[PDB]
Design a protein around this ligand. Structure first.
Ligand SMILES: OC[C@H]1O[C@H](O[C@H]2[C@H](O)[C@@H](O)[C@@H](O)O[C@@H]2CO)[C@H](O)[C@@H](O)[C@@H]1O
Ligand SMILES: OC[C@H]1O[C@H](O[C@H]2[C@H](O)[C@@H](O)[C@@H](O)O[C@@H]2CO)[C@H](O)[C@@H](O)[C@@H]1O
Lengths: 436, 411
DNA sequence: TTCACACGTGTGAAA
DNA sequence: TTCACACGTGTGAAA
C-alpha cells in the first residue's frame, strides 16, 4: 500500500534496480521524499491484482506491451507532461505508451534482442539459423555447445517464429485486429519446427531457462546466447570477451524480435502523482538519472534524446537498434497478455514433446484470439446458474415435503425425481433410462 | 543434475561437479508433483522437515554426526544424507549498533531512535513463517507436542497463549510502523546489506552477501521475548536420492566421495556458508568461527524440526496465519485459530478425489437419461428450447402438482 | 450474442 | 468414512 510522502517502485529483477535506487537517494536528498525500489517476482502479474483495489506501488516499470491492459482496467494515471518535456523524448517512444489517445506511462528505453557470441570460441558468428546444427556438432567435439537461450519465455523464441511470417495481431486500418492472429500460419510453424528440431537433434534442451543460459554463456560453455542490453553487465564481469550482432536469418529472412519500450506507469491510486511525476521527469529521465541506471544494467536505446545521442555511439547499441529495425514495436492492447500466455504454452509444450508444433500453435491461435468475457458477462452466467439451481431446489423441497413418495431417509434428488416419474406413469431403470 | 535452493552455494557445488546443478523455484513443491510422472531430479537438497511426507508417498556412516542422521531417518530408514545444520541468528550492523538488543521488547524504542537517523532497527522476511517461528515459540507456541516417543498430531500449539503473544508482538511492531507486512527475503537482505537497517534475522547462507557489502556485521543470539529465548526450528539440509533415478550409486558416490569431503564442503562453503556441517572432520575447523558458535547457540535453544508428513500442512497453515495477521486481514486470534484447525488437515487421496468425480459423473448421467426420456416420450407442451427445469415442471403438473415461477411446488 | 448441461471440487451433512 | 447439493466456469449449441 502506498503511503503518502514517499515513493515505492517496482522494476523487474533483470534491470538496474540498484542504480535506480541511487536516483531515489538523490531525490530523497533534495526534496526529502524517501524512495524505495523493489523487484518482486511476476510483478507484471501482481500489479493488476493489487492495483484494482488501490494497492500496489506508486510507480511500476515494465515493457510497454502490458500497460494498455493496465490502462483499460483503470490502474494507471494519465501522464500529463508539458509539451516542452514531451519533445525531449523520441516521438515513437511516446507512441508506445499512447492508449486510446492518452499517454499512460513515461517511456524509458528501447529494448531488442540481439545475438551475443563468444569471440574467442567463435570469431565469425553464423548468419543463418540453418547453419547452427552443423556448428554445434563442431563445438560439441570440444565439449561446448553452440547456442543456449531462455526457452521458458516466448519473448526469446518469437524472433524465430516471426521470421518466416508468424505474427501476433495483424495491423490494419490504423488498428490491431484482435481477431486476426498469426501464430498458426505457415511461417510460425516453420520457425517453431526448426526450434523443436534443434531440441530433438540434441542441439538445445527444452528446460533451459534464463539463469541456465546466462550462466552457460558467461562461463564460456556455449558460444552464443540471445539476450537484451540488460545482460551485458554480467558478461563484462565474466571472463568472456563477447560481441553483439544481428540475429541470424531463417529461410534467408531476418529474425524479427518484438521490440519493447521499458516504461514507468503511475498507479492511479497513488497519493503521490506529482512526486512520482517529478521523480520521473526531472530526476530519472535526465542524463544523470539514466546514466546511474544504465551503469548498473544497460538500458538499451534510451528515449531521452540528449542521453541517447551518447549511448548511440556504442556499437552494442548500434547492433541492438539494427535488430530493432528488423523487428516491430509490440502492441500495447489489453489482449497482449492473452497472446503471450498462449505462445508461452505453445513453445513449452512443443519443445517438451507434449504437443506437436501444429497442435501447440493451433491451440495458441484460438487462445490468443479468444473473446474474454467481461465481469458482467461472468456475473450474468453466475447468476443464471444460481437461479437454475434455486428453482430446482424449491421444486425438490416441495416434492419431499408433500410427496410421501416412500423414499429412504436420506436420498438424493434423482431418487425423488424417480418417485415423481413413477407417480406420473413412467418406469425409471436404475441407470436412469426412462419411458412410459 | 541436482536441485538446490537458490540461496545455497550452487556455484560452489557446481565446482564440485566439474571435478567429478540447477536452482529451481519452489523446488520443494515441484518435486512431489513431478515425481508422480517419473520426472524430477536425481538428488534433491532441502531441510529434513519435508522428507517424511516424501517417504510416506514413496518418492525417495560415522564420518557424520549422530544426530544429523536421526533428522533424516523416518520409519527406521535413512532417506537422505545430512550435509549441514541450520539455525537462524540475529545479524546486526556493528557501526549502527555496537551493542545489539537482547530482548524483543526494546526493539520498538530502538527503531524510534534509528528512524531519526534515517535508519530502521530490524528487517527480516515476513513472508516465510520460518523467520517468525522463533518469536512464536518463545512464550510457549509449538507445532506438534512430542510425547511418549512420538509427535502427537492431536496436540498442536499454534493457537495457545504463547503463540498468540508472539504473533501479537509481531503484529504490534507492524501496526506501530516498526516493520512492514510486505517485507520479504530480498527486501530485508537489501536493506541490511546497504546499511539501511540495523538488524536482520537469517541463516549462515546469507553471510557471503554481507561480506561482499561494506557492512561490518556480527552474528549473535536471537533476542528474548518475555524473558524467554527465541526458539528457532533447526533444519538439517539433506540430500535425498530420487527413487526414480537410474543413477543412484553414481550419485551416491558423488555424495560420499566428492561432496561430503573437506575439499568439497569447503568449496560450497566458500560460495555460501552452509552452517555447521554434518561432517566431523571439517566441522572441527568451522566450529572455531564465532558466527558458527552463534548459530549453534541459537540452535540449542531451538528444536529440531519434525519430519512427519503433517509438516507441510503445518507450514502452510502458519504461513497464511502470519501473512493474514500481519496485513490486518485477520485478527491474531482468528488467524491462529484457523492455523490450529488446518495444521493437521487431512489431504484427500487421489482415489478419494476420483470417487467424488465418478459419483457426480454418475449423478449427472442418471438425471440426463431421465430428462432425455421425458423429452422424447413425454409429448409435453414445452417451448422449442427449454431447460430441464421446464421439463421437470411439466412432469410435476402431470403428476398433479402446481409449480410457481420460482419453483415453489405444492398440490 | 445468450444459454444449458458438463465438470470437478467445495462446504458441510450424516454417520 | 461416504455423500449431495453448491459453486462458477467450460464447452458448445442455437441463434
Ligand atoms: O516472454 C513474454 C514476455 O515478453 C516480454 O518480456 C520481456 C521484457 O520485455 C524484457 O524487459 C525482459 O525482462 O525480458 C522479458 C521476457 O522474460 C514482454 O514485455 C512481457 O509482457 C511478456 O510476458
Ligand atoms: O518458511 C517455512 C519453511 O521453513 C523452512 O525453510 C527454510 C529452509 O529450511 C532454509 O534452508 C532456507 O531455505 O530458508 C527457508 C525458509 O524460507 C523449511 O525447511 C520449509 O520446509 C518450510 O516450508
Amino acid at each position: 500500500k502506498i503511503e503518502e510522502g514517499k515513493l515505492v517502485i517496482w522494476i523487474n529483477g533483470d534491470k538496474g534496480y540498484n542504480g535506480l535506487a541511487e536516483v531515489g537517494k538523490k531525490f530523497e536528498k533534495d526534496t526529502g521524499i524517501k524512495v524505495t525500489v523493489e523487484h518482486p517476482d511476476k510483478l507484471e502479474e501482481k500489479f493488476p491484482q493489487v492495483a484494482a483495489t488501490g494497492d500496489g506501488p506508486d510507480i511500476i516499470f515494465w515493457a510497454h506491451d502490458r500497460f494498455g491492459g493496465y490502462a483499460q482496467s483503470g490502474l494507471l494515471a494519465e501522464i500529463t507532461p508539458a509539451a516542452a518535456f514531451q519533445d525531449k523524448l523520441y516521438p515513437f517512444t511516446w507512441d508506445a505508451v499512447r492508449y486510446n489517445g492518452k499517454l499512460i506511462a513515461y517511456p524509458i528505453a528501447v529494448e531488442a534482442l540481439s545475438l551475443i557470441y563468444n569471440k574467442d570460441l567463435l570469431p565469425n558468428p553464423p548468419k543463418t539459423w540453418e547453419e547452427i546444427p552443423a556448428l554445434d556438432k563442431e563445438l560439441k567435439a570440444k565439449g561446448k555447445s553452440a547456442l543456449m537461450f531462455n526457452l521458458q519465455e516466448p519473448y526469446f523464441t518469437w524472433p524465430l517464429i516471426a521470421a518466416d511470417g508468424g505474427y501476433a495481431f495483424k495491423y490494419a486500418a490504423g488498428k490491431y485486429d484482435i481477431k486476426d492472429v498469426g501464430v498458426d500460419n505457415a511461417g510460425a510453424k516453420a520457425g517453431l519446427t526448426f526450434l523443436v528440431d534443434l531440441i530433438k537433434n540434441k542441439h538445445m534442451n527444452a528446460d533451459t531457462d534464463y539463469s541456465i543460459a546466462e550462466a552457460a554463456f558467461n562461463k564460456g560453455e556455449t558460444a552464443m546466447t540471445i539476450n537484451g542490453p540488460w545482460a551485458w553487465s554480467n558478461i563484462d564481469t565474466s571472463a568472456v570477451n563477447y560481441g553483439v550482432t544481428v540475429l541470424p536469418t531463417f529461410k534467408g529472412q531476418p529474425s524479427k524480435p518484438f521490440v519493447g519500450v521499458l516504461s514507468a506507469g503511475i498507479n492511479a491510486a497513488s497519493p503521490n502523482k506529482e512526486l512520482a511525476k517529478e521523480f520521473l521527469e526531472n530526476y530519472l529521465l535526465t542524463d544523470e538519472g539514466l546514466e546511474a541506471v544504465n551503469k548498473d544494467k544497460p538500458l538499451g536505446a534510451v528515449a531521452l534524446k540528449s542521453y541517447e545521442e551518447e549511448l548511440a555511439k556504442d556499437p552494442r547499441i548500434a547492433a541492438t537498434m539494427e535488430n530493432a529495425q528488423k523487428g516491430e514495436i509490440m502492441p500495447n492492447i489489453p489482449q497482449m497478455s492473452a497472446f503471450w500466455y498462449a505462445v508461452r504454452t505453445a513453445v513449452i509444450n512443443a519443445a517438451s514433446g507434449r504437443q506437436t508444433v501444429d497442435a501447440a500453435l493451433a491451440a495458441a491461435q484460438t487462445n490468443a484470439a479468444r473473446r474474454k468475457p467481461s465481469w458482467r458477462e461472468r456475473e450474468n452466467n453466475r447468476r443464471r446458474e444460481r437461479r437454475r439451481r434455486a428453482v430446482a431446489a424449491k421444486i425438490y423441497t416441495g416434492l419431499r415435503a408433500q410427496g410421501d413418495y416412500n423414499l429412504p431417509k436420506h436420498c438424493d434428488n434423482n431418487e425423488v425425481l424417480k418417485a415423481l416419474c413413477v407417480e406420473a406413469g413412467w418406469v425409471v431403470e436404475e441407470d436412469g433410462t426412462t419411458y412410459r
